[PDB]
Amino acid sequence: GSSGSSGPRLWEGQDVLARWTDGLLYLGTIKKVDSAREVCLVQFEDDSQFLVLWKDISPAALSGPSSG
């Protein structure tokens, strides 16, 4: 029971976490979203705006581990 559906949104203005060459996740803000190259231009606290792939980007949970 599965069909073609988009999971991630990575819409403009979505708080996400962009990984770094080191491996850890960094705080990034979805500035742009390109479907053609399937990427998303994220910005860093250092006014650093670049093109971050869709896979490279990591989901940032707001609430947390929903228990219950």
Swiss-Prot record:
Tissue and organ distribution:
Highest levels in heart, skeletal muscle, and pancreas, lower levels in brain, placenta, lung, liver and kidney.
Report the residue ranges that make up the Tudor domain in this protein. Answer: 8-62
Linked disorder reads:
A chromosomal aberration involving PHF1 may be a cause of endometrial stromal tumors. Translocation t(6;7)(p21;p22) with JAZF1. Translocation t(1;6)(p34;p21) with MEAF6.
The effect of residue 44 to A is: Abolishes histone H3K36me3-binding
Give the UniProt subcellular location, in the record's own words: Nucleus; Cytoplasm, Cytoskeleton, Microtubule organizing center, Centrosome
Q: What is known of its domains?
A: The Tudor domain recognizes and binds H3K36me3.
Q: What is this protein called?
A: PHD finger protein 1
Task: Give the family per the record.
Answer: Belongs to the Polycomblike family.
Q: How does it assemble?
A: Interacts with CHMP1. Associated component of the PRC2 complex. Interacts with p53/TP53.
The record gives the effect of mutating residue 20 to A as: Abolishes histone H3K36me3-binding and localization at double-strand breaks (DSBs)
Gene responsible for this protein: PHF1
Resulting phenotype, residue 45 to K: Impairs histone H3K36me3-binding
Protein function: Polycomb group (PcG) that specifically binds histone H3 trimethylated at 'Lys-36' (H3K36me3) and recruits the PRC2 complex. Involved in DNA damage response and is recruited at double-strand breaks (DSBs). Acts by binding to H3K36me3, a mark for transcriptional activation, and recruiting the PRC2 complex: it is however unclear whether recruitment of the PRC2 complex to H3K36me3 leads to enhance or inhibit H3K27me3 methylation mediated by the PRC2 complex.
Q: Domain of life here?
A: Eukaryota
